[PDB]
Amino acid sequence: NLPTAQEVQGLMARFIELVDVGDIEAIVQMYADDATVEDPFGQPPIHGREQIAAFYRQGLKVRACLTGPVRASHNGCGAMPFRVEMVPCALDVILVMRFDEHGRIQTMQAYWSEVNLSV
Amino acid sequence: NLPTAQEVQGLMARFIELVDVGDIEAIVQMYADDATVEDPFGQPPIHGREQIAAFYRQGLKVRACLTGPVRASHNGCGAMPFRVEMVPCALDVILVMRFDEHGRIQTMQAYWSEVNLSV
């Protein structure tokens, strides 16, 4: 059901793993069929697995890793810091995710902008 | 006015500084007079400087520091990872803040729970 704190840490860390290897399909499957995503938060929310899949396929020679432990709540929520290394540029990002009673991402917000870009 | 990305990084980092030295008053002043706070996110939102002041005075022998750079958006939003060290326990936390046109925290959400506790 709704992921407990420990379960959030697990799903979210796994997410970074998926993004890291670039397994698009596995990514999309982690999301609820109608999940929404704002990455970067504020411009603009995409909806559903088809658009999410297009988004990730669009983004993924890319590597990502946790730069801190996953922070989790008890109401199916979580946040985590991580970094993606593309091109020789690097991007620090923090994601906030809300899971549903099925353990799948309902919403995800990515926080970052040029100020978190390096190279 | 509304803090630009760079300005968010500055205000938020400063916030950690304030929490670190324990300057309660300075903390409260960073918040808007009617700001709300959920720390930990989900149990339950407090409102206004009087309650916020009581909250911080309640929480603050305490030290805190950034464990990663501040992630900022362009719509007055931001998130940052940090750690607080009390008792010999440690707590990893991620905060998300929204600032107003006056550069003061309108809302703040703290993400963490026992799973982020150490000692």
Quote the number of domains for chain B: 1
* Count of CB pairs separated by less than 8 Å, A with B: 97
Look at chain B and count its residues. Answer: 119
* Amino acid identity, position A17: E
User: Domain range spanning residue B11?
Assistant: 1-119
Supply the CATH number for residue B27's domain: 3.10.450.50
Phi-psi group of B22: left, alpha or beta (phi > 0 → left; psi -120 to 50 → alpha; rest → beta)? left
Collect all residues with Cβ–Cβ distance below 8 Å to A91 and sequence separation of at least 6: A83, A84, A85, A112, A116, A117, A118
Torsion of CA B104, A74, A55, B76, to 10 degrees: 0
Which pairing describes strands B117-118 and B89-99: parallel, antiparallel, or unpaired?
A: antiparallel
Contact A2, A103 (CB under 8 A): yes
Give the method used. X-ray
Peptide bond into A40 cis (omega under 30): yes
Residues of chain A contacting B, Cβ within 8 Å: 5-6, 9, 40-43, 67-69, 71-75, 77-81, 92-94, 96, 111-116
**Which residue from B99, B108, B100 is spatially nearest to B47, judged by alpha carbons?**
B108
Rounded Cα distance between B70 and B11, Å, is 10
Contact A70, A9 (CB under 8 A): yes
Look at chain A and count its residues. Answer: 119
- Report phi then psi at B8, rounded to 5: -65, -45
B107 contacts in chain A (CB < 8 Å): none
Contact A86, A61 (CB under 8 A): yes
